[PDB]
């Protein structure tokens, strides 16, 4: 509002997308426990973590870049974040690890695990799970933008957090982590984060109004108010402007969404197979490629902001392009200059 509510939220984005993850951590982190004989580490409650990802979310008014709530519980027991730290408090060395798992294709772990794999294929012990973790980290965005800064204590020379080392490698620190239960762990995460992001909408009776779900779907883009006001018109046309959606309703759409690399093919086919895209089209395809059943209400609001302006004809190349960048959250970008990865890129092809 022309005050430190928009000029700050638009600063939040420029710190969420180009600053070193050390600055991103200690900015969003709020708790700074000193319950020690004089030591001091800084954690972040799980709610802050999801804020450290989604743009257009303002940190509480006072606990900014180095204003912390000094301590001397947070996440539910079933929530994945309880295996971390003490109650839900994410340390730094975990937050950086916890963000390579969230935004890495499932194939990369299928390969990383099956290549070091000291004896067999799919299982790795601890010391092999440090190369694997370090390698996959050395390819993600937040991996090449993180030079250890011991001055502020936020260093990553620690192993895994060790409140989950045992969750993975047993108490003896000897168990060989199979690849199967890991890719289950990751899914347990991505569904847990999708819950926190959902609860950050004040769900009355577990219901989220249609407009608040649209904003939850396009959040990882620029400004598209014109689009959410477009579906705002259809709210009176389809008369479902007082129904909302539940958490299980939205979650199915995001399970469908994990197969976008195939629904792009399906929709493109129907486009060139002489068929007009509408509710009966995508409702069916969600059953034949993703096998997940979508409700009409979700298939109502999607075309309400993705069709050819009032005809239900889903504009594929606009739809897949956005879902491509919202499926993997806004942390696949280079998050750095574009110079060296272009200059040396210019050398190699311009020479021939």
């Amino acid at each position: 509002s022309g005050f430190r509510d928009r000029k700050v939220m638009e600063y939040e984005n420029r710190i969420r997308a180009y600053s070193t993850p050390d600055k991103i951590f200690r900015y969003f982190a709020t708790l700074k426990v000193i319950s020690e004989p004089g030591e001091a580490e800084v954690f972040m409650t799980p709610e802050d973590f999801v804020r450290s990802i989604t743009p257009n979310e303002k940190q509480p008014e006072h606990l900014g870049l180095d204003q912390y709530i000094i301590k001397r519980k947070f996440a539910d027991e079933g929530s994945i974040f309880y295996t971390l730290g003490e109650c839900g408090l994410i340390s730094f060395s975990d937050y950086i690890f916890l963000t390579t798992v969230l935004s890495t294709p499932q194939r990369n772990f299928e390969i990383a695990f099956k290549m070091f794999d000291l004896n067999g294929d799919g299982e790795v012990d601890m010391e092999e799970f440090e190369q694997v973790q370090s390698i996959i980290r050395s390819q993600t965005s937040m991996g090449m933008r993180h030079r250890d800064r011991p001055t502020t204590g936020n260093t990553l020379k620690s192993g895994l957090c060790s409140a989950l080392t045992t969750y993975f490698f047993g108490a003896d620190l000897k168990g060989k982590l199979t690849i199967k239960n890991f890719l289950e762990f990751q899914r347990k995460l991505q569904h847990d984060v999708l819950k926190l992001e959902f609860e950050r909408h004040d769900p009355v009776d577990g219901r989220i109004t249609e407009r608040q779900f649209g904003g939850m779907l396009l959040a990882y883009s620029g400004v598209q108010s014109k689009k959410l006001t477009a579906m705002q018109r259809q709210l009176k046309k389809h008369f479902k402007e007082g129904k909302g959606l539940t958490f299980q309703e939205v979650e199915n759409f995001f399970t469908f969404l994990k197969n976008i690399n195939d629904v792009d093919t399906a929709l493109s086919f129907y486009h060139m197979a002489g068929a007009s895209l509408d509710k009966v089209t995508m409702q069916q395809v969600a059953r034949t490629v993703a096998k997940v059943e979508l409700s009409d209400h979700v298939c109502d609001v999607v075309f309400a902001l993705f069709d050819c302006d009032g005809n239900g004809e889903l504009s594929n190349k606009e739809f897949v392009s956005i879902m491509k960048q919202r499926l993997m959250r806004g942390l696949e970008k280079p998050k750095d200059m574009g110079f060296t990865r272009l200059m040396q890129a210019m050398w190699k092809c311009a020479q021939e």
Binding site: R14, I15, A17, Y18, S19, T20, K23, D336, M337
Partner: protein, 160 residues
């Protein structure tokens, strides 16, 4: 010996009254032909000293426009496209990059970089490089200007 000196001094005063009264009528006829050997030559220099002024008055402005684009290149990167944390290490290596040009300019011309001095020296380099093209004799010119100073420094020294 010493007597030869004083008689020399009292001979001048008996002759210089007709010497100074002569040099006044002699300087004029000697100064005026210069003031006619100068006017046709001055009309050329008064033009090269203006078509070498415009060449160094748009280097002044041009040197300010560069301080404006380089201020719009960074007021756009810092706020709209990129952040400040990614645009700061590059707006220091030019605030220090220029502090390496203001020293490479010194060692290049043995003169410190100051706005008035570095403007005049640039003007001179434009003049001679411009005076060489119109081919008017700068040697005869400047030696007609100092020769006027001579015929003027003494005519003021002839108050008596």
């Amino acid at each position: 010996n010493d007597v030869k000196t004083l008689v020399q001094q009292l001979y001048t005063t008996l002759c210089i009254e007709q010497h100074q009264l002569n040099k006044e009528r002699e300087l004029i006829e000697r100064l005026e032909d210069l003031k006619e050997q100068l006017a046709p030559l001055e009309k050329v220099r008064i033009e090269i000293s203006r078509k070498a002024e415009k060449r160094t008055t748009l280097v002044l402005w041009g040197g300010l426009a560069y301080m404006a684009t380089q201020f719009g290149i960074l007021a756009r990167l810092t706020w709209w496209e990129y952040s400040w944390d990614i645009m700061e290490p590059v707006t220091y290596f030019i605030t220090y990059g220029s502090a390496m040009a203001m020293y490479a300019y010194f060692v290049m011309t043995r003169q410190e970089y100051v706005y008035p001095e570095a403007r005049d020296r640039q003007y001179l380099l434009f003049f001679h490089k411009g005076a060489k093209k119109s081919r008017f004799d700068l040697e005869k010119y400047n030696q007609l200007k100092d020769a006027i100073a001579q015929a003027e420094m003494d005519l003021k020294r002839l108050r008596d």
